From a paper:
Here, we report the first crystal structure of an ecdysteroidogenic regulator encoded by the Halloween gene, noppera-bo (nobo). nobo encodes a member of the epsilon class of cytosolic GSH S-transferases (GST, EC 2.5.1.18; hereafter GSTEs). DmNobo forms a polypeptide homodimer with a canonical GST fold, which has a well-conserved GSH-binding site (G-site) and a hydrophobic substrate-binding pocket (H-site) adjacent to the G-site. Consistent with the requirement of GSH for GST function, a defect in GSH biosynthesis in D. melanogaster also leads to larval lethality, which is partly rescued by the administration of 20E or cholesterol. These data indicate that the nobo family of GSTs is essential for ecdysteroid biosynthesis by regulating cholesterol trafficking and/or metabolism. In general, GSTs catalyze various reactions with an activated glutathione (GSH) molecule in the following three ways: GSH conjugation to a substrate, reduction of a substrate using GSH, and isomerization.
DmNobo D113A lacks the sidechain carboxyl group at position 113 and therefore cannot form a hydrogen bond with EST. The crystal structure of the DmNobo D113A did not show significant structural differences compared with the WT DmNobo (DmNobo WT) protein. In contrast, the enzymatic activity of DmNobo D113A was not inhibited by EST, even at a concentration of 25 μm. In contrast, it was barely possible to determine the Kd value between DmNobo D113A and EST because of a weak interaction, which was consistent with crystal structure analysis.
Author numbering:
A (entry chain BA): 4 to 221
B (entry chain AA): 4 to 228
The structure:
Amino acid sequence: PKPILYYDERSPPVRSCLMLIKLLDIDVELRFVNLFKGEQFQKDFLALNPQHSVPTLVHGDLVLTDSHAILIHLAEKFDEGGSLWPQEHAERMKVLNLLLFECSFLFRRASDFMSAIVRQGFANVDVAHHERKLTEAYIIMERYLENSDFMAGPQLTLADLSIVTTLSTVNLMFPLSQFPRLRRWFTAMQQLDAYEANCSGLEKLRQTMESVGSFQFP
Amino acid sequence: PKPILYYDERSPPVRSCLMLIKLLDIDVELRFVNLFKGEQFQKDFLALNPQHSVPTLVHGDLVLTDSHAILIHLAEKFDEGGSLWPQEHAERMKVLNLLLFECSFLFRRASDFMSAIVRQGFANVDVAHHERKLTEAYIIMERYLENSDFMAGPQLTLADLSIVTTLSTVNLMFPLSQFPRLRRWFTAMQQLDAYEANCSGLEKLRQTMESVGSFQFPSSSAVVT
Ligand SMILES: N[C@@H](CCC(=O)N[C@@H](CS)C(=O)NCC(=O)O)C(=O)O
Ligand SMILES: N[C@@H](CCC(=O)N[C@@H](CS)C(=O)NCC(=O)O)C(=O)O
């Protein structure tokens, strides 16, 4: 059976999977779960993913509940021998390391910020606090890009797909003007054909955040 | 060259790596980084890991800055063909899925709670809020254990090592009375010889948290076997 992707394209991790699907030309059935209607809490979805999170992938009997597992699974099944998920161990571990940085550091801080807006309203968020936390993430990624054109080495990998969507999301609020390597990398990522998969959901997130948070991004 | 682990045993992700190192009898050089003295911001360590986090592994030219990459790398290098990081694709993805649950959900909520204690003092923490967030993680893990004997399947995997350290940390505060599958699984993990690598750092974390947060964990909460 073909993979089924439960998604809300406002989610950056969802968009990372949409980018990989477009890049690899994977035939996938999309199923929309409206997060702002709480549809991730529907009984059948909760039974599928008790974390009530998107993306969720069902591929035969395999149920994956994290974008980084989905990216790795789809690359191993549909891009065997490719460069996105390198076969050499040391290169593959470096890609894994940056996927985990996205999960544990960049997305965590991006999510803390956006969730504060949704829960408290923009006017009640300590913007300077989150600017510091997310600027530290920029500084780190700027250092990652010192030696290489891409996040995990000289070529595009799953790590770039994971990071670029969340970065595009934080960039709605905090510009990359002070980080030349990171701004160069982002501009290059935007020139990928597969980057078109990020556009619609980013804009829908922009609109939804501005309405629910009662503010406007700069 | 032998792996070098930069570590503070009070960190649950560090303890997950320490458990794997003991289980596989890997010879590793330990290099202590005291998180509560701010040694992770020393210029040389920041250059090595700009996320200023432990565990950090240096193995030859490879530098890993996340416990879940370290667990996978060490399993592939010293448990080749083993079952901790299974060779069949679907089983391996399930282990990876639960590793990421620990990183994205359980540890995130456990860290939010402990960080608030250190930053604010326990008396100024919204403990009820964090009890709800961490009880929800308990429910999710109970659901996983209702469908499988261990976290990711019928046998011990890297996912159990990653999750048990953070679970034991959360359970210093919040009891597992209402979670029979979690209690049975946790008791089984505590029977492992490798669990010795979790005991000491858990106790040191308990002492440090009580000191810095000016409070006491409820002694009845922690599951002891
Ligand atoms: N680490 C997870 C993060 C998944 C996640 O948090 N998704 C958010 C949207 S960005 C979500 O589904 N929120 C719904 C909820 O938590 O109830 C991954 O990479 O897939
Ligand atoms: N996802 C990372 C989390 C690492 C982490 O946050 N470690 C904490 C200790 S539990 C740390 O080093 N804190 C020091 C700091 O952030 O300055 C992993 O699994 O290794």
